């Protein structure tokens, strides 16, 4: 009851979709014998389907008139109604990893800037240095904040610019 | 509701606050001839349509000509008719 | 084999290895934790 | 040298005179979080606050837990005590948290401004004469004065070891609270009951034999 | 597309446009249940318009056969 | 310089010590420019005097029994017959609205044509309490501090009413009847998660 | 004498140059009273592939 | 020519924020707009296109013409 | 310097011997700064005089039979008709609350405008007992010691009531009736486990 969206545990279109997918799979399964390789595969697929539907209905997901789970992007509606694991939690889950990648690459660039040929340390990766930085980039948020507060994350007006500034 | 009373009063109040209250401020603001110079220095007919061809002299001591009168009375008529119209539907929202 | 390991440290080889690793990690995560639409565990 | 890894290369920022003065410096910085001396100072303050808070809280968890396992008290489990205490309380938890955040923000903002400039809360006229006793000491994080009634910081013989005891018991207590959390989420019982169940059958009651910690095993 | 191809449309990323739906409910669309400004029959914004455009506006915006603030989804 | 607003924080260099009410509070650096600071110094005292009068009125209208500050203007709407101290007044909304426009226009235009004037001794200082002396500086400090307190108090009136729907004195009585069950945290407005 | 030394690092203040606000190493300064005596070699080439360029005493600044 | 009103140059040269957050602000902009037909044309095309999109977005939601919204092709 | 507070402990250097009541007790070093120490010296005597009056009143209200100090304010709540020596007084809570605010505001403002004044001879010394002499120092010592004792005694009133619910004299009678079965250790409050 957020935007007229019913829970997927209470929606009938959701159960209809589940039984429809299972009917497709068992109509494929009728063609094979008891324990064939295709029969094993289709039974595993049916089990995965039932598990997926149970696990989406168990996760408190909201469904529309089509019986499909709809995600709640808004923090405040996601945190009020228990939908933070849809978009809100994976947001910071992603941002951690993305800042991880960016911070590690940044540290690698800054570390290889000192060498005589910094370009050949970019087509030929310094793997020990890269792995050291990849391991110690797990604390990228704290290090990035502390590099932001020292004024050493940013470059000053030494960057290059076109003639009309 | 006496629309004559309402509109005469609005116009009189606005003319008063234009003559006695906001005349000095309006004269201080309207004196733009500054960095902001005249629109035209030319002598064409279309350059003259932008000059003040007629300075509206007034024997009012504070310098309150027919243009100040027109403006403050227009504001007064507008506000008086707003009062009359908002009273016309016998109420207000809040 | 210093030169061979220098070759393996080249951008395309390292990219291939790293993306094989990332894709295999994601594939194994999706095999053992199938159909993760939401963070609920 | 007293390292965490006897054969490790200790980072150069934890071998400096400014860092070897810090309590409990065993060279542990595999992520390089304190390579900036200012960040190392701020994180030393964070470590001290976390360690003292965790010591207080873990005592308040397991000491009354041990005393209710021994019958001296009937304190509920630490994951139940909030509901029990708020159902016997004069106030809702919201007003409680509000008063708490005001009272804690005041003293923590004073501590903050003392971290920003050491010895600044002793600016005369700020408090009502009590600001005199709020200058702290030469060492940040060790304020002293009214926070030191028994005067145990006035030795310069037991001072380094006092520091070390504090920081080590505090790291241990931080780990202990993390363990309380994980053991509740993995067992559903209290920490002292977890200790009892491990001591009655260690080789079949541990984190390897619950279904949470090692799903592959 | 890949989820509909694999026959599993319940795995789609269907993010509900709750901001535009909140705006719509602020204009009086009672389909979402936000009950904020003009969909809230107790608000001052709703009360002060009832002598005015709001009856017609709310009969027109809650009619789902016109194009006045169409119902929106993922 | 009277106070610090943040013990340990050294004062901004653009706030003079001779300014009445200077605690060094300009974290946004709004008064860094001297002309901006002069306008703000006048506007602070004006807002503060108006807020002192406003809080005095919102408290006197409820302590004397004529309702709260919020429900006073609901004679224009919801009927008519304005009252003052119980004495009904022969002015409807339009008449007194227009007279207020006219009177306040005259007054505030006379005030604005004076440039920056915040302490106009003479016709506004008949009892002779401020002559730019020790007492005058101390009284300016008192004025600005009571004005800041009254501004905070009127913001509190507005917020407490928008959250609770009560009056200032009614909310004070609610709090004294239940200090822990009746505060900003116990309404379902201020702290939503609570 | 005029100009920076023959190994000094120098920053370019010519706006139309590819290395505007970029640091290059001085190769040579022509002591003859010529326009653009300072020869600056850069470690990153321009769009034409050139790594050096001649700059005046106005257009170069120390470090 | 009647002595009352604003001069756009005054309005523009007066709107210079303190804190220099916009630098000189809109100083010297009246000359730039009034002497450049391409500045005027860009402003006019911007506004005209934005209000053309407004026309499009509002004439379908609030059909002004009778027996429009039942002429679907129209 | 009168006493040591800890035989063997040598006195802090910031506590002057001429200070009435100096036993060298500053283990927290709160009075190390001279201005802090001056404020504390005034506040100690003020707290002590107020506590002497308060303990005298809490003892006289119970020794004369008008209940305890804690139950005296329950006429405002729980009904009305304040009493004094049995004589009912025609003041409800609001009237005397406001008059107390006004009177104590006047008094303590007159006291605060005096700067640091703790021994204001004259209108407060009519019988002429203290003229900054040998007797004056001895009497200041007596005053501060009785004030410290009365502060301890009022803290005892509050704690003993919060633990037992009795009055001071009622608790004294309980203790004299059972010195070993009625003390701080026998209530289920002071000592945690028993
Ligand atoms: C940018 C758009 C976008 C977005 C947001 C998504 C999002 C998603 N897709 Mg879709 N997809 C996309 C584009 C996108 N996809 C495209 C372009 C294609 C076509 C190629 C597909 C094809 C596709 C398929 C076929 C499937 C998905 C699936 C998924 C889900 C993956 C869940 C998962 O793997 O959990 C992974 C969970 C994690 C926690 C991993 C996070 C990463 C690391 C491990 C976290 C760090 C931990 C720790 C710090 C590491 C320590 C160090 C380590 C080295 C040990 C998720 C909802 C799957 C699904 O089930 O959807 C419902 C699925 O079957 N997608
Ligand atoms: C602070 C120290 C500390 C202590 C004394 C204990 C003690 C215990 N834990 Mg807990 N635990 C801790 C920290 C601690 N834990 C932390 C930090 C975590 C999060 C990773 C956990 C997570 C955890 C789980 C999930 C479970 C236990 C369980 C147990 C019990 C069985 C041991 C086990 O399965 O391995 C403990 C598991 C670990 C991963 C080891 C963490 C130990 C850390 C590194 C500190 C201690 C190491 C130290 C050098 C040696 C002991 C110090 C001691 C003398 C003080 C036992 C009572 C199990 C239980 O309840 O059984 C009844 C159980 O299921 N613990
Ligand atoms: C991107 C902009 C944006 C928009 C349009 C909204 C829109 C809304 N928010 Mg959200 N919100 C946002 C960002 C946004 N939010 C962010 C970044 C935060 C911080 C995490 C919040 C935290 C938040 C809370 C805590 C609440 C809202 C609420 C609301 C509603 C009022 C409305 C649906 C309220 C709500 O739940 O509406 C019913 C509410 O209580 N918002
Ligand atoms: C949040 C608590 C906290 C904080 C702020 C610190 C901070 C610090 N520690 Mg301590 N430490 C802690 C908990 C903490 N520690 C615990 C629980 C242990 C026991 C496992 C230790 C054991 C330890 C040792 C043995 C040593 C330190 C040292 C240090 C210093 C250098 C490391 C650094 O800059 O990283 C700053 C670290 C943080 C800001 C923490 C970030 C938290 C991450 C992001 C999450 C980790 C989650 C975890 C894996 C589960 C620094 C002052 C060294 C030292 O004293 O040198 C002066 C040293 O030798 N620490
Ligand atoms: C970080 C420190 C910390 C925190 C947040 C708490 C928090 C709490 N404790 Mg614990 N406690 C602590 C340290 C802490 N304790 C320590 C160090 C001890 C040992 C001296 C105890 C011994 C203890 C006992 C014996 C009991 C509590 C209780 C409580 C609860 C009620 C608080 C209370 O008495 O009213 C506020 C009290 C003031 C004096 C203020 C609350 C969950 C009670 C409880 O769980 O009730 C359900 C309870 O019976 N605590
Ligand atoms: C609108 C009322 C108003 C105005 C114009 C000012 C203006 C000023 N104050 Mg005052 N002040 C006010 C209200 C106001 N204050 C209130 C209510 C308090 C109590 C909380 C204070 C407490 C205070 C202290 C303690 C100090 C000042 C100081 C100053 C001066 C420097 C700061 C500055 O430039 O801010 C300019 C401020 C504005 C332009 C107001 C903008 C408000 C923004 C747009 C919204 C704020 C919304 C709010 C958070 C929630 C509602 C300046 C003359 C300092 C000084 O030197 O005094 C002489 C100083 O030390 N003020
Ligand atoms: C503050 C704290 C605990 C506080 C506990 C409190 C208040 C408990 C309160 C209560 O229980 C009671 C009392 C009673 C209950 O009824 C109520 C509550 C309220 C529940 C724990 C901190 C706990 C903090 C922890 C566990 C931090 C661990 C950090 C680690 C391991 C960091 C490691 C590294 O950062 C370094 C050191 C160096 C890097 O280079 C490498 C890495 C590895 C990154
Ligand atoms: C709160 C307020 C201003 C607050 C400003 C603040 C905090 C500014 C803070 C800062 O800027 C500084 C200082 C420095 C910056 O670096 C930092 C920030 C943080 C940005 C003004 C209120 C100002 C409030 C005023 C002027 C109130 C006037 C009230 C009146 C006239 C009331 C009238 C009535 O109540 C009666 C009398 C009877 C009723 O029936 C009718 C009505 C009309 C409702
Ligand atoms: C206990 C007390 C203060 C104790 C302070 C101590 C120990 C300080 C100790 C230290 O700081 C030093 C010295 C030095 C530091 O280095 C060390 C420490 C240790 C930190 C004050 C009480 C101070 C107590 C005072 C002021 C009491 C006043 C009581 C009054 C007015 C009572 C009034 C009533 O009882 C009647 C009359 C009738 C009733 O019906 C109504 C009421 C109102 C209840
Ligand atoms: C002689 C004299 C006098 C008197 C005078 C007078 C009396 C004057 C008047 C004047 C006036 C009397 C003026 C008027 C003006 C007016 C106006 C100017 C108007 C306008 C209007 C308008 C503009 C309108 C608009 C509108 C409309 C049309 C409709 C509706 C809407 C609106 C409203 C908007 C005296 C005694 C003082 C003395 C001195 C001299
Ligand atoms: C290049 C150039 C140019 C051009 C440019 C352009 C083209 C731009 C555009 C722009 C644009 C195109 C813009 C747009 C904008 C928009 C806006 C800005 C909007 C706003 C809105 C608002 C503000 C709203 C409000 C509201 C709402 C929200 C709803 C309801 C109502 C109201 C009112 C409340 C020129 C010539 C100048 C010159 C220079 C260069
Ligand atoms: C809250 C509900 C009521 C809202 C208040 C309505 C205010 C509307 C103002 C309209 C009249 C404006 O004029 C009024 O303010 C101007 C400043 O802004 C003053 O202008 C004054 O300050 C300027 C500062 O450079 C200078 O031009 C002069 O010193 C002076 O003219 C006018 O002297 C005054 O008459």
UniProtKB/TrEMBL annotation, chain D:
List of residues binding chlorophyll b 4: 83, 100
Main location: plastid
Annotated binding of chlorophyll a 5, by residue: 42, 50
Binding site for chlorophyll a 13: 165, 169
Residues bound to chlorophyll a 7: 108
Localization per Swiss-Prot or TrEMBL: Plastid, Chloroplast thylakoid membrane
InterPro entries: Chloro_AB-bd_pln (IPR001344), Chloroa_b-bind (IPR022796)
Binding site for chlorophyll a 18: 198
Binding positions (chlorophyll a 14): 166
An example Gene Ontology biological process: photosynthesis, light harvesting in photosystem I
Residue sites binding chlorophyll a 6 per the record: 50, 108, 111
Residues given in the record as chlorophyll a 22 binding sites: 213
Residues involved in chlorophyll a 20 binding: 207, 210
Binding site residues for chlorophyll a 1: 4, 47, 50, 165-166, 169, 171, 183, 198
UniProt keyword terms in alphabetical order: Chlorophyll, Chloroplast, Chromophore, Photosynthesis, Photosystem I, Photosystem II, Plastid, Thylakoid
Chain sites annotated for binding chlorophyll a 15: 169
Key word Thylakoid present: yes
Binding site for chlorophyll a 10: 144, 166
Binding, chlorophyll a 19: 198, 206
Record-linked PANTHER family: CHLOROPHYLL A/B BINDING PROTEIN
Function as written in the Swiss-Prot or TrEMBL entry: The light-harvesting complex (LHC) functions as a light receptor, it captures and delivers excitation energy to photosystems with which it is closely associated.
Protein name per UniProt: Chlorophyll a-b binding protein, chloroplastic
Annotated source species: Chlamydomonas reinhardtii
Lineage: Eukaryota, Viridiplantae, Chlorophyta, core chlorophytes, Chlorophyceae
Automatic annotation (TrEMBL), chains F, I:
Residues where chlorophyll a 5 binds: 39, 47
Protein residues bound to chlorophyll a 14: 100
Binding-site residues for chlorophyll a 28, renumbered to this chain: 175, 183
Biological process, per Gene Ontology: photosynthesis, light harvesting in photosystem I; response to light stimulus
Binding, all-trans-violaxanthin: 26, 28, 58, 69
A matching Pfam family: Chloroa_b-bind
Binding site for chlorophyll a 4: 23-25
Residues reported in the UniProt entry to bind chlorophyll a 25: 160, 184, 187
Chain sites annotated for binding chlorophyll a 15: 108, 111
Protein's name according to its UniProt entry: Chlorophyll a-b binding protein, chloroplastic
């Amino acid at each position: 009851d957020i935007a007229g969206l019913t829970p997927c545990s209470e929606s009938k279109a959701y159960a209809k979709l589940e039984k429809k997918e299972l009917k497709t799979l068992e109509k494929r399964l009728k063609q094979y014998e008891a324990d064939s390789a295709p029969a094993v595969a289709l039974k595993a697929t049916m089990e995965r389907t039932k598990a997926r539907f149970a696990n989406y209905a168990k996760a408190g997901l909201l469904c529309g008139n089509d019986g499909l789970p709809h995600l709640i992007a808004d923090p405040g509606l996601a945190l009020k109604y228990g939908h933070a694991g849809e978009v809100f939690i994976p947001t910071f889950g992603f941002l951690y990893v993305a800042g991880y990648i960016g911070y590690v690459g940044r540290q690698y660039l800054i570390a290889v800037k000192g060498e005589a040929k910094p370009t050949d340390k970019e087509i030929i990766i310094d793997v020990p240095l890269a792995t050291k930085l990849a391991w110690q980039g797990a604390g990228w948020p704290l290090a990035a904040v502390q590099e932001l507060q020292r004024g050493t994350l940013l470059e000053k007006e030494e960057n290059i610019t076109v003639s009309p500034r | 509701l006496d629309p004559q009373i309402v509109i005469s009063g609005s116009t009189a109040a606005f003319l008063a606050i234009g003559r006695f209250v906001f005349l000095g401020y309006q004269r201080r603001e309207a004196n733009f001839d500054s960095t902001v110079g005249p629109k035209t220095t030319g002598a064409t007919y279309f350059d003259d349509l932008q000059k003040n061809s007629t300075i509206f002299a007034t024997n009012d001591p504070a310098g309150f000509n027919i243009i100040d009168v027109a403006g403050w009375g227009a504001l007064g008529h507008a506000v008086g008719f707003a009062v009359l119209a908002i009273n016309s539907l016998q109420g207000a929202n809040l | 084999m210093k030169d061979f390991t220098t070759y393996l440290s080249t951008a395309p080889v390292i990219a291939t290895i790293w993306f094989t690793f990332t894709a295999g990690l994601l594939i194994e995560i999706n095999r053992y934790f199938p159909d993760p639409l939401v963070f609920s565990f | 040298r007293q390292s965490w890894l006897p054969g490790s290369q200790i980072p150069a920022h934890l071998d400096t005179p400014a860092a070897q003065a810090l309590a409990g410096n065993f060279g542990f910085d595999p992520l390089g979080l304190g390579k900036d001396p200012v960040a190392l100072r701020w994180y030393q303050q964070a470590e001290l606050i976390h360690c003292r808070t965790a010591m207080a809280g873990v005592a308040g968890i397991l000491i009354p837990g041990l005393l209710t396992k021994a019958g001296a008290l009937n304190v509920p489990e630490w994951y139940d005590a909030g509901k029990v205490a708020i159902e016997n309380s004069f106030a809702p938890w919201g007003s409680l948290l509000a008063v708490q955040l005001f009272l804690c923000g005041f003293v923590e903002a004073k501590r903050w401004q003392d971290i920003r400039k050491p010895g600044s809360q002793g600016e005369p006229g700020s408090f009502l004469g009590f600001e005199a006793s709020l200058k702290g000491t030469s060492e940040l994080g060790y304020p002293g004065g009214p926070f030191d009634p028994l005067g145990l910081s006035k030795e310069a013989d037991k001072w380094a070891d006092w520091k070390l005891k504090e920081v080590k018991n505090g790291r241990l207590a931080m780990l202990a609270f993390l363990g309380f959390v994980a053991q509740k989420y993995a067992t559903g019982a209290g920490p002292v009951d977890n200790l009892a169940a491990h001591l009655k059958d260690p080789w079949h009651v541990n984190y390897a034999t619950n279904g949470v910690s090692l799903p592959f095993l | 597309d890949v989820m509909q191809a694999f026959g599993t449309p319940e795995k789609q990323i269907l993010i509900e446009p709750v901001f535009a739906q909140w705006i719509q409910a602020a204009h009086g669309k009672a389909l979402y249940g936000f009950d904020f400004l003009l969909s809230s029959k107790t608000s001052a914004a709703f009360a002060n318009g009832q002598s005015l455009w709001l009856p017609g506006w709310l009969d027109a915006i809650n009619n789902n056969q016109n194009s006045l603030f169409l119902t929106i989804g993922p | 310089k009277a106070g610090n607003w943040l013990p340990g924080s050294d004062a901004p260099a653009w706030l003079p010590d001779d300014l009445p009410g200077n605690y060094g509070f300009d974290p946004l650096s709004l008064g860094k420019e001297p002309a901006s600071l002069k306008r703000f110094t006048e506007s602070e005292v004006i807002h503060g005097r108006w807020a002192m009068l406003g809080v005095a009125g919102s408290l006197a209208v409820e302590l004397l029994g004529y309702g709260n500050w919020y429900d006073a203007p609901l004679w224009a709407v919801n009927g008519g017959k304005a009252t003052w101290f119980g004495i009904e007044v022969p002015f409807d909304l339009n008449a007194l609205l227009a007279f207020e426009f006219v009177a306040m226009a005259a007054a505030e235009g006379q005030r604005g044509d004076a440039g920056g004037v915040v302490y106009p001794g003479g016709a506004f200082d008949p009892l002779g309490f401020a002559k730019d002396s020790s007492k005058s500086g101390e009284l300016k400090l008192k004025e600005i501090k009571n004005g800041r307190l009254a501004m905070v108090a009127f913001l509190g009136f507005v917020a407490q009413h928008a959250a609770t729907g009560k009056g200032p004195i009614a909310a004070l009585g609610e709090h004294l009847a239940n200090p822990w069950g009746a505060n900003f945290a116990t309404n379902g407005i201020s702290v939503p998660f609570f | 004498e005029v100009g920076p030394k023959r190994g000094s690092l120098v920053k370019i203040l010519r706006p139309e140059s590819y290395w505007f606000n970029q640091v290059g190493k001085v190769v040579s300064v022509d002591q003859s009273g010529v326009r653009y005596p300072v020869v600056v070699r850069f470690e990153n080439q321009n769009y034409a592939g050139v790594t050096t360029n001649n700059y005046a005493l106005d257009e170069v600044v120390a470090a | 020519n009647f002595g009352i009103g604003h001069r756009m140059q005054a309005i523009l040269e007066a709107h210079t924020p303190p804190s220099g957050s916009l630098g000189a602000g809109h100083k010297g902009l009246f000359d730039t707009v009034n002497n450049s037909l391409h500045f005027q044309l860009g402003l006019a095309l911007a506004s005209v296109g934005t209000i053309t999109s407004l026309v499009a977005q509002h004439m379908y939601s609030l059909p002004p013409y009778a027996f429009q919204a039942i002429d679907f092709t129209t």
